[PDB]
Design a binder for this molecule. Structure first.
Ligand SMILES: O=C(N[C@H]1c2ccccc2C[C@H]1O)[C@H](OCc1cccc(F)c1F)[C@H](O)[C@@H](O)[C@@H](OCc1cccc(F)c1F)C(=O)N[C@H]1c2ccccc2C[C@H]1O
Lengths: 99, 99
């Protein structure tokens, strides 16, 4: 589909059998979701945004469906203000910017 | 053009007669550039992202050229780690997300 940007590019994602709303963010290198429970072991990671850095938990090879498109990749979990689908997963679903 | 997301979507912008590198950021509501001098009056504003909020100066009716495309809109100036072209200007150049 083609998504305009007059409003936030929010889409529904499915992870851990649950539906959540997330933002398609080309400005995010990685994907970070609000505090939640994921399986497996996690590794520590620091991600910096416009206001500074936050510590997040890194989970690898996580199944996540974005707008019906299945992706399997690294998902970060931490005190993010909103669920963010970053470039690591945007590339998996073949998302591009056009103008 | 069509921009893939394997790497950060950085483009050259022209503003205030200066050429700068900026990120096409669909996750950013507004456009914020690193400290610089702009004409006209400004209003203080607080913007929040990952890590928290930063104080920026809000300038309105600013003309910017993004990849040859002229756009007009509000531009925020402050301690942002990277120049960000947000939705307020991305819409003006007809930028969309496609997959
Ligand atoms: O932090 C980023 N990437 C980082 C990231 C994100 C997730 C995972 C990994 C990494 C690493 C890096 O790429 C991106 O910034 C460019 C950026 C790029 C590289 C290094 C940086 F330092 C950096 F700032 C990101 O797209 C932010 O722009 C955006 O985050 C999602 C978000 C959305 C809505 C409300 C929020 F509160 C919020 F957070 C955000 O903060 N949006 C806010 C914003 C921005 C400009 C003007 C106004 C407003 C208000 C709101 O829309």
């Amino acid at each position: 589909p083609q998504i305009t940007l007059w409003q936030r590019p929010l889409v529904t994602i499915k992870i851990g059998g649950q539906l959540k709303e997330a933002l398609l963010d080309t400005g995010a290198d990685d994907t970070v979701l609000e505090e939640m429970s994921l399986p497996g072991r996690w590794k520590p990671k620091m991600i910096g945004g416009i206001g500074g850095f936050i510590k997040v938990r890194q989970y690898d090879q996580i199944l996540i469906e974005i707008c019906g498109h299945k992706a399997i990749g690294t998902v970060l979990v931490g005190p993010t203000p909103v669920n963010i689908i970053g470039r690591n997963l945007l590339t998996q679903i073949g998302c591009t910017l056009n103008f």
